[PDB]
Amino acid sequence: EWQTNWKKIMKRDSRIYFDITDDVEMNTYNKSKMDKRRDLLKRGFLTLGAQITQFFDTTVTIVITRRSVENIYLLKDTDILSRAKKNYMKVWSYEKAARFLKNLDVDLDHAPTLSNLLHNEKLYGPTDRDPRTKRDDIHYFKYPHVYLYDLWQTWAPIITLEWKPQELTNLDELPYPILKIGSFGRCPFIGDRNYDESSYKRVVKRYSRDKANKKYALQLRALFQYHADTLLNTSKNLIFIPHTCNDSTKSFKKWMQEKAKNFEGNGLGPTRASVMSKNMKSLSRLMVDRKLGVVKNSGYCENCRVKYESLEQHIVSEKHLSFAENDLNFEAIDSLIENLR
Amino acid sequence: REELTLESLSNVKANSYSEWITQPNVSRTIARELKSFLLEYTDETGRSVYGARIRTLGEMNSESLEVNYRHLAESKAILALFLAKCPEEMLKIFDLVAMEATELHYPDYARIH
Amino acid sequence: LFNLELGRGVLVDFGLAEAQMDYKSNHEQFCPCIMRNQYSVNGVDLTKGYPKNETRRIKRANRAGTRGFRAPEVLMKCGAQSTKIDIWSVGVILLSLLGRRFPMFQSLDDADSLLELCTIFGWKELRKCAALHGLGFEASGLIWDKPNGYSNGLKEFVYDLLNKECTIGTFPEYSVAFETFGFLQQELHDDAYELKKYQEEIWSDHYWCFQVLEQCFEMDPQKRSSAEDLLKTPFFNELNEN
Amino acid sequence: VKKVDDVTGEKVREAFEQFLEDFSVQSTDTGEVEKVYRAQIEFMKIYDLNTIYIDYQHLSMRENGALAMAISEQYYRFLPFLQKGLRRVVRKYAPELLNTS
Amino acid sequence: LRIIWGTNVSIQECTTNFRNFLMSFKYKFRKILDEREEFINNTTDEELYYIKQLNEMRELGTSNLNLDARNLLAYKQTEDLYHQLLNYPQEVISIMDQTIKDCMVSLIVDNNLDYDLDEIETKFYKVRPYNVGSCKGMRELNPNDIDKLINLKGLVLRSTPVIPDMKVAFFKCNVCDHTMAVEIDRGVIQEPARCERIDCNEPNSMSLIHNRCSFADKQVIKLQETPDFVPDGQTPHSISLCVYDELVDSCRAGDRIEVTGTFRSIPIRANSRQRVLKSLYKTYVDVVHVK
Ligand SMILES: [Mg+2]
Ligand SMILES: [Zn+2]
Ligand SMILES: [Zn+2]
Ligand SMILES: [Zn+2]
């Protein structure tokens, strides 16, 4: 059982140097793939959380050498294997380190099919390009943004909001709802806009509205005070929980403290396609107001599948009259008219 | 072939040390081996003197590494001899080596110096 | 529709009432969200940005409902919708009463309502909610007043909705909100003994009310409580008279 | 510099290599399994030919048609990879054909 | 709001009007328009005409809708859409293609049909207005008629072989073999002056790979005018028509065809060496429909 007795010092006394030298002559492609092994052991030791010292020290626990640990018989006094013998350092080789990693129960290996590659190339363009580079085909985010997408990438992204920095100015109105609290029943996100509840001109309104609205709330209070069920209402009269926060009545008494003689459309919509053509998106750049060039009831009509600007002319139109006169359309409802009767 | 070791570095296939050091097969070997020398060398007490020098360099934003000649001569005699021989091609490879060594401890240091 | 003096009500509108169909014609299949049967790389990421000219169809899921009462599962286009969402619409009303704000959410857009839910809860909660329906959420660079705001709970939320109210003076002297405000001053720390045990009555009521309020306000559809279990909760311990 | 590799190009080259090596045909009552293209390679080795004749009918069967699509539809893209695969196959089988002689 | 600069066309209003026309047009409207009300038969002239056409195109898998322009005159809401289409064929036809896609998606979803929506969404639908106002021959068109939807009638004399028109330019790095794919924009392709890869920034490393680019079909057809009105003293005229990507080789020599298309003008370079254009523009027709 090596996975526990060796993993206790794994978190507290576990700091390792990786040797970079090579004893014997080597090839350049082989040099690259031994660099890849060095990084592979690096991230196989990194995943477990073991600290690593790039600077060789005397407080180093393990060194792993592409050097021959074995045949150590003749070496320089300054060579790191000599000082590993010298300070009880746990000397390993890369094959021995691979054996240890296999005994760690950690994966050595951390598109398979040509048909899958061709399917991937049917979308996403081809693959003859740098895998990690700004594709110039996909709009990348650099400013404050909100982006909700499908991880399966099977559906189009639902939310793509991208605001320029100057749009983030004027904190009175953001393009997104920053939480605001508000007062007097306001929608929290909505502020008191052009509304100063501290203005007495406003105050003589809310307290007075509360005076006429007083006893409706008193009746409701007395009716919902003791029992949640209202069938046991009839039974000292009113009880209240004491408070100290100032009020509309307290505010108005304060304003007499401070000012009075003293100092201080239809509901439906057409079914539109999701994919926008490139030409239609290009036309969006050329838009100008109708000041250049060239009955409130308006909305969609699920019967005729046409949008109207006027109800009194849609109902008298040809298609709507034809639909209404055709009793085959109103068939399932015809079951109900006489099913109840 | 295209990659050498410290032992094979002594045998020079060129007429003079300048052509030897300029040769890429020798240049990469020298660069790797100086990278090793900066990392491994430690004092008799245990202090990695180049370790502390890199930290001081990073903590002071300096661009000077105070590399000693005892440590190079004792650790890698052939490279100290090469430095004393052709100090123009050397101190050009090793300045890069020192930059790499100080970037490992102090990442994103090229933006400063 | 609720008559106060009789004290009971009825559900009237059904024009937009969809009928659920079966789950199959424990979070492996009810909600990887596979519906529409469309559940059956190198060089491109599709996480750091969106395609400039998109050639994919947007999901088509039911969005019928009302602004500011749409559940998280109906805010992010999710097939396999269940009755659970209506439970969410119960909480918002329960949240409207506690706080004395009727228009709880402006909800100008689906994205706008979803970001409104980010302010009361937090970006991480909304993203972990999205990760359930198979969708990924991402937002950065935004000046949210509290990151992961109102984490103490919706308790602190109503307390702030009441704080601005109890400092300016927007409540009357015969108000009922002051009881909730003084009970959150309990929950947050920031003769005449009908006073004391009606004190205990309304405090126990508020304490359990926030429990049902947070069961209603849950991101997970499945682990959200149903109507039966929500009615069996000890906040409603007045059903013995039946 | 890290030259960009065409992943599907390498895959098509490997598929072409197995097509050249492992392809077999059933003779018409005159013999058992015969590898057509290895025989063609040794034929053009003996007779010092430069052209190898690949039958598209034979190629369509391999890789459930996935090699067939890519070679027919993107021939100008995958031609160097086909050349590399053929050169490797010649290098392992009949290695003396890679020189002008 | 938000009309297009240089045109009367508003995307929202034009889309709404064309959708209403598509959902609610019957051929009895045109029979009334042509003062032929006594030919009106209730059986086939009282069915939505374009709804049936859209259903047939969905069932058959086709992508082109043949829109009779005069039909837009029959409908009241599209009396202005007719003039907008004639005056601004490009914008209006693009809006009509988008509207056709929306209309077919609505037909599939609203009626809850079984048809898959994946291949509908990815399909490019096109509109082919043909029966636009027939007059003015070809020689009576003034420069104010450039970029307008005109209708010619004549005889096909000749047709050039299929010309490849590059739509996507495929470049390749001479150093790291990294490739971008530039899209054409109004006949101009922005050749990269640097490899976009952050690893190498060689200035002139990129080279155009002609045989790996994306090409489309273009064909020039020589037509002899046979106008309804021939002014005194003039001789028969010959014009060049341009067919694109599905109309190539649809007209053979000796065919008598009525062609509806955009009256275009292009500046012709005086010499092949320098970039200097001639002040006298050359006129031709971009074919959108052949009858
Ligand atoms: Mg309703
Ligand atoms: Zn109608
Ligand atoms: Zn779901
Ligand atoms: Zn490059």
Side-chain angles (χ1 to χ4, degrees):
Chain A
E1 189 171 343
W2 276 333
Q3 212 58 38
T4 300
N5 48 7
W6 189 260
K7 199 176 282 194
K8 53 156 71 70
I9 53 179
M10 183 66 75
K11 202 66 193 297
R12 300 184 186 280
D13 196 70
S14 178
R15 293 182 183 174
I16 296 97
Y17 179 82
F18 294 93
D19 190 83
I20 198 73
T21 66
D22 212 312
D23 304 333
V24 66
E25 290 80 29
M26 294 300 293
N27 194 313
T28 56
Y29 190 75
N30 214 310
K31 178 184 183 176
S32 47
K33 68 180 182 180
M34 311 215 78
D35 269 341
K36 291 189 286 183
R37 293 182 183 174
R38 182 179 185 266
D39 292 331
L40 163 64
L41 274 68
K42 184 73 68 68
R43 293 182 183 174
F45 278 47
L46 187 68
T47 308
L48 295 174
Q51 209 49 71
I52 46 171
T53 44
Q54 320 275 29
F55 289 130
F56 179 82
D57 289 345
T58 51
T59 51
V60 185
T61 55
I62 298 101
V63 297
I64 300 92
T65 67
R66 292 181 295 103
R67 292 198 180 124
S68 164
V69 176
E70 293 177 350
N71 81 25
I72 202 177
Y73 303 173
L74 271 297
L75 263 178
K76 280 288 150 169
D77 171 53
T78 314
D79 193 356
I80 61 171
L81 303 165
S82 87
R83 292 173 296 180
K85 277 180 71 80
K86 299 296 183 181
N87 302 318
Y88 296 136
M89 311 296 203
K90 183 67 181 294
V91 54
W92 287 344
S93 160
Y94 269 69
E95 60 173 356
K96 182 154 176 62
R99 275 179 52 154
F100 177 80
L101 188 152
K102 185 61 168 69
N103 291 48
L104 281 170
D105 288 333
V106 61
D107 198 349
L108 289 65
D109 294 347
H110 309 83
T113 300
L114 181 49
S115 165
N116 280 115
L117 269 178
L118 297 197
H119 192 70
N120 285 34
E121 287 184 349
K122 271 195 181 295
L123 294 174
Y124 311 143
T127 66
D128 193 359
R129 51 183 323 281
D130 207 14
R132 323 160 311 285
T133 302
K134 299 293 170 281
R135 199 188 156 83
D136 197 89
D137 194 303
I138 297 169
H139 175 272
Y140 280 106
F141 286 128
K142 59 186 48 164
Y143 298 162
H145 71 286
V146 178
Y147 174 63
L148 187 146
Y149 64 102
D150 184 50
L151 295 174
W152 292 30
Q153 313 276 349
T154 299
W155 302 110
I158 283 153
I159 304 172
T160 64
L161 299 169
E162 176 48 6
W163 305 289
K164 295 245 159 189
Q166 58 65 30
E167 265 191 343
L168 273 298
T169 59
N170 199 343
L171 275 66
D172 184 43
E173 307 108 330
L174 273 300
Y176 63 93
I178 62 100
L179 177 63
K180 292 189 292 185
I181 298 285
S183 36
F184 177 80
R186 298 292 180 85
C187 169
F189 309 91
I190 292 180
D192 308 318
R193 292 173 296 180
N194 277 46
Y195 272 130
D196 47 355
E197 282 80 3
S198 288
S199 62
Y200 176 77
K201 185 67 159 65
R202 274 297 284 166
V203 160
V204 175
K205 296 292 184 289
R206 292 181 295 103
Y207 166 72
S208 290
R209 181 177 181 170
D210 287 342
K211 192 194 281 189
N213 207 1
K214 196 215 281 180
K215 293 179 179 179
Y216 164 72
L218 275 296
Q219 288 176 273
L220 186 48
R221 180 69 180 271
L223 195 155
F224 273 22
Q225 183 64 328
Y226 289 2
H227 295 88
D229 182 39
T230 187
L231 276 297
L232 319 167
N233 281 163
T234 305
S235 54
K236 273 80 176 177
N237 302 112
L238 295 174
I239 73 170
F240 309 96
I241 296 312
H243 55 269
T244 59
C245 300
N246 71 1
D247 289 345
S248 171
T249 75
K250 286 201 190 156
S251 70
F252 173 54
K253 291 179 181 178
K254 168 53 65 170
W255 291 103
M256 292 177 72
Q257 293 177 335
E258 176 178 272
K259 181 180 183 294
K261 179 62 173 171
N262 62 7
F263 302 88
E264 172 59 31
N266 189 359
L268 295 174
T271 300
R272 278 162 286 225
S274 53
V275 184
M276 207 59 163
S277 63
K278 302 188 273 168
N279 303 138
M280 272 290 273
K281 284 183 176 179
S282 298
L283 296 176
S284 303
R285 188 180 66 245
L286 306 168
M287 311 291 248
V288 296
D289 308 286
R290 185 178 294 114
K291 66 150 282 166
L292 284 72
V294 72
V295 298
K296 69 185 84 168
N297 315 66
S298 66
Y300 199 54
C301 167
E302 213 172 354
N303 280 6
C304 298
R305 307 286 167 190
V306 298
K307 182 181 301 180
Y308 58 87
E309 56 164 353
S310 178
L311 200 44
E312 293 177 350
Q313 298 159 25
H314 174 69
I315 64 158
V316 309
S317 168
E318 183 280 335
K319 189 180 184 187
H320 196 86
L321 288 176
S322 310
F323 183 83
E325 293 293 329
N326 182 27
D327 288 332
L328 269 65
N329 292 135
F330 294 115
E331 182 64 28
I333 305 162
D334 280 344
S335 171
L336 282 72
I337 294 169
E338 50 84 20
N339 195 1
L340 323 173
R341 320 166 86 121
Chain B
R1 296 194 175 187
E2 290 87 5
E3 189 173 339
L4 279 295
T5 184
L6 187 69
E7 185 280 335
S8 67
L9 188 65
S10 167
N11 279 74
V12 176
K13 303 288 110 173
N15 54 6
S16 61
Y17 292 70
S18 161
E19 290 83 3
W20 189 236
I21 300 188
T22 48
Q23 214 178 13
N25 309 335
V26 188
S27 76
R28 321 188 190 113
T29 309
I30 286 177
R32 186 178 47 75
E33 183 65 13
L34 289 168
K35 185 78 165 286
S36 162
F37 160 73
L38 296 186
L39 299 173
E40 282 84 76
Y41 192 90
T42 196
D43 188 330
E44 78 196 296
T45 183
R47 297 277 82 78
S48 86
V49 290
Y50 303 140
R53 276 168 182 161
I54 294 288
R55 182 180 65 255
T56 298
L57 181 142
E59 88 187 6
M60 293 180 183
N61 277 34
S62 168
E63 57 174 341
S64 66
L65 189 49
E66 172 56 308
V67 168
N68 193 305
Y69 192 85
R70 297 292 180 85
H71 311 156
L72 191 50
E74 294 183 1
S75 184
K76 281 78 179 176
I78 191 66
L79 275 191
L81 186 144
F82 273 27
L83 182 81
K85 211 57 64 181
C86 188
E88 184 76 35
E89 272 61 29
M90 304 265 294
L91 296 174
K92 180 183 308 154
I93 292 166
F94 177 80
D95 272 322
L96 294 174
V97 161
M99 189 46 173
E100 286 189 336
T102 198
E103 278 190 298
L104 292 181
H105 183 157
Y106 271 86
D108 203 354
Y109 193 79
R111 266 67 165 174
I112 305 169
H113 278 266
Chain C
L1 291 201
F2 187 79
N3 204 339
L4 295 163
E5 288 163 357
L6 278 174
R8 59 176 182 183
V10 297
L11 268 190
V12 280
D13 178 57
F14 274 95
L16 294 173
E18 185 169 281
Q20 195 176 21
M21 68 193 88
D22 289 345
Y23 58 102
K24 182 69 176 178
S25 185
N26 208 29
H27 297 165
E28 61 188 1
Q29 293 177 335
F30 166 66
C31 185
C33 295
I34 294 169
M35 222 55 225
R36 312 295 84 79
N37 278 275
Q38 294 300 320
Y39 75 108
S40 303
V41 294
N42 213 12
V44 356
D45 197 47
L46 309 167
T47 306
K48 299 239 299 199
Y50 61 96
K52 291 174 65 175
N53 295 90
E54 287 162 56
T55 54
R56 276 166 320 188
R57 51 172 191 126
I58 194 166
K59 193 160 185 179
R60 206 162 302 247
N62 208 343
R63 204 188 65 90
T66 301
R67 244 200 292 141
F69 300 88
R70 266 174 210 114
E73 143 182 15
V74 301
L75 264 183
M76 51 205 63
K77 293 180 171 65
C78 183
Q81 270 165 17
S82 70
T83 65
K84 300 292 141 233
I85 62 170
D86 292 333
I87 300 300
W88 175 278
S89 291
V90 189
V92 192
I93 302 170
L94 182 60
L95 186 63
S96 178
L97 289 166
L98 300 165
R100 278 80 178 90
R101 323 299 191 77
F102 176 39
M104 201 35 58
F105 303 95
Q106 209 179 359
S107 291
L108 295 176
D109 294 283
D110 282 88
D112 190 277
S113 195
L114 187 63
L115 298 176
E116 287 185 62
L117 304 169
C118 286
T119 76
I120 311 169
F121 296 86
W123 181 65
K124 277 73 69 177
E125 284 194 63
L126 270 298
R127 189 192 60 200
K128 186 200 306 186
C129 178
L132 186 50
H133 304 262
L135 295 174
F137 198 57
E138 210 273 346
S140 68
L142 295 174
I143 61 171
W144 269 322
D145 184 1
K146 186 200 306 186
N148 186 340
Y150 300 117
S151 66
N152 281 334
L154 295 174
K155 300 229 211 215
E156 197 179 3
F157 183 43
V158 296
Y159 175 76
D160 290 30
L161 284 191
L162 295 162
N163 289 337
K164 183 68 180 295
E165 285 194 281
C166 295
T167 56
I168 297 170
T170 53
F171 284 128
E173 62 168 1
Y174 57 96
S175 173
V176 178
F178 293 137
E179 322 178 341
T180 296
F181 194 40
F183 164 85
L184 296 188
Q185 266 169 337
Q186 301 304 2
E187 297 309 309
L188 277 298
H189 315 295
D190 273 334
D191 189 68
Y193 63 89
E194 293 177 350
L195 277 296
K196 182 263 183 185
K197 183 180 68 65
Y198 164 96
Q199 185 64 60
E200 180 65 286
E201 186 68 32
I202 63 166
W203 289 357
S204 47
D205 275 1
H206 278 82
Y207 166 76
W208 288 108
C209 196
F210 282 92
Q211 302 299 358
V212 296
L213 184 142
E214 291 186 321
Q215 288 177 8
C216 303
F217 267 58
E218 188 172 1
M219 321 313 272
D220 192 297
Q222 264 307 291
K223 178 178 62 194
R224 190 173 319 168
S225 62
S226 64
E228 294 265 32
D229 313 329
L230 198 58
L231 262 181
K232 303 297 288 179
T233 189
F235 178 73
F236 298 121
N237 289 332
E238 293 82 3
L239 62 80
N240 55 5
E241 290 298 319
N242 66 334
Chain D
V1 291
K2 179 69 176 177
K3 270 204 186 258
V4 173
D5 61 350
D6 196 318
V7 174
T8 196
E10 294 293 328
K11 189 52 69 180
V12 170
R13 172 187 56 73
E14 298 163 347
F16 198 49
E17 274 169 297
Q18 293 177 335
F19 166 70
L20 283 187
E21 299 179 308
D22 312 340
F23 189 71
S24 305
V25 63
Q26 285 292 114
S27 68
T28 47
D29 202 39
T30 178
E32 65 256 9
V33 165
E34 169 180 16
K35 277 134 186 177
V36 176
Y37 300 101
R38 302 218 293 220
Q40 195 169 222
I41 290 173
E42 61 85 30
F43 190 78
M44 59 181 288
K45 172 179 70 179
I46 297 162
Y47 298 65
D48 193 37
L49 311 178
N50 292 266
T51 291
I52 179 168
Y53 291 73
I54 308 284
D55 198 324
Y56 193 86
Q57 215 59 24
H58 297 159
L59 186 57
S60 68
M61 294 183 284
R62 294 299 292 265
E63 206 82 29
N64 56 70
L67 187 50
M69 296 297 103
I71 283 172
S72 79
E73 281 187 14
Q74 321 208 28
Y75 192 95
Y76 181 87
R77 176 199 188 172
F78 295 139
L79 186 51
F81 302 100
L82 298 201
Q83 293 266 33
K84 291 192 190 304
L86 172 66
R87 273 188 43 84
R88 285 167 47 115
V89 171
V90 175
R91 204 177 214 188
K92 66 182 304 185
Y93 297 140
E96 51 267 16
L97 190 62
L98 294 174
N99 294 121
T100 64
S101 89
Chain E
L1 283 78
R2 314 311 291 305
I3 68 149
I4 303 180
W5 169 256
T7 80
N8 280 309
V9 178
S10 167
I11 284 186
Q12 293 69 45
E13 181 182 70
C14 278
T15 312
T16 291
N17 293 322
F18 191 51
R19 203 201 184 96
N20 295 3
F21 168 82
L22 285 162
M23 301 300 153
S24 67
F25 179 75
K26 291 157 211 186
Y27 209 86
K28 69 179 181 182
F29 288 145
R30 186 176 181 185
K31 285 178 184 178
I32 289 164
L33 182 64
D34 293 329
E35 301 285 353
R36 295 166 34 102
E37 307 94 10
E38 63 90 18
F39 284 90
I40 294 183
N41 64 34
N42 289 337
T43 299
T44 189
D45 184 1
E46 285 248 19
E47 50 172 324
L48 302 171
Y49 190 51
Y50 290 107
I51 285 298
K52 177 194 56 145
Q53 298 212 357
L54 286 172
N55 279 310
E56 291 167 0
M57 294 180 359
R58 194 191 69 247
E59 282 150 24
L60 268 62
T62 64
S63 300
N64 297 293
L65 181 73
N66 290 26
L67 181 64
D68 192 316
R70 193 141 163 88
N71 285 348
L72 300 162
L73 283 178
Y75 209 54
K76 185 62 76 195
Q77 273 74 40
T78 56
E79 282 177 350
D80 309 316
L81 188 55
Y82 175 80
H83 299 284
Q84 301 205 94
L85 160 75
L86 262 57
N87 282 353
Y88 320 101
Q90 207 179 36
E91 289 82 26
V92 175
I93 290 170
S94 284
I95 295 168
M96 290 186 162
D97 305 352
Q98 194 48 50
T99 308
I100 287 306
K101 195 194 270 193
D102 295 82
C103 281
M104 298 196 64
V105 163
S106 166
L107 282 194
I108 297 169
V109 167
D110 294 356
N111 305 347
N112 295 290
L113 305 172
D114 187 1
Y115 214 93
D116 188 12
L117 276 193
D118 277 298
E119 67 163 311
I120 302 281
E121 288 282 352
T122 59
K123 203 189 290 290
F124 284 150
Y125 288 92
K126 293 188 79 73
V127 187
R128 294 195 181 155
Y130 50 98
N131 193 17
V132 301
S134 81
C135 76
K136 250 195 174 181
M138 175 66 169
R139 287 206 197 122
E140 295 302 320
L141 294 173
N142 299 302
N144 60 67
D145 296 323
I146 297 296
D147 271 329
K148 281 193 194 174
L149 208 60
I150 67 154
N151 197 337
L152 297 190
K153 184 168 71 71
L155 179 75
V156 177
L157 291 180
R158 203 175 64 213
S159 60
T160 80
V162 183
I163 301 150
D165 200 93
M166 205 191 290
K167 299 289 94 176
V168 168
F170 193 91
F171 295 91
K172 190 174 183 235
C173 194
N174 292 138
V175 176
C176 74
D177 296 65
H178 162 66
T179 72
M180 61 225 77
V182 178
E183 291 256 4
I184 199 166
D185 183 35
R186 278 154 289 175
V188 164
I189 282 168
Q190 297 270 40
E191 173 185 344
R194 217 198 268 274
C195 185
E196 90 179 2
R197 189 193 217 215
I198 58 172
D199 296 83
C200 75
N201 275 3
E202 307 280 327
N204 290 276
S205 57
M206 298 303 307
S207 64
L208 179 71
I209 315 294
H210 319 290
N211 308 290
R212 217 170 154 199
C213 294
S214 287
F215 292 99
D217 302 317
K218 175 209 177 168
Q219 190 182 63
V220 184
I221 290 154
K222 191 194 176 182
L223 192 83
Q224 262 180 10
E225 304 303 332
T226 67
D228 293 292
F229 180 70
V230 180
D232 56 356
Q234 77 174 6
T235 55
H237 190 47
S238 179
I239 200 65
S240 296
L241 315 174
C242 282
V243 294
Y244 291 102
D245 300 336
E246 76 265 350
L247 291 183
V248 161
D249 271 319
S250 50
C251 312
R252 290 153 283 280
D255 278 336
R256 321 192 185 157
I257 58 151
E258 190 203 280
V259 60
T260 300
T262 315
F263 182 41
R264 288 260 157 82
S265 80
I266 194 70
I268 295 303
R269 301 194 332 150
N271 315 123
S272 54
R273 280 85 178 277
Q274 39 175 4
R275 297 286 293 172
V276 195
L277 308 159
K278 288 196 283 281
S279 178
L280 203 62
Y281 274 35
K282 176 204 187 318
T283 47
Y284 61 99
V285 170
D286 285 69
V287 170
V288 303
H289 187 273
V290 172
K291 190 168 72 58

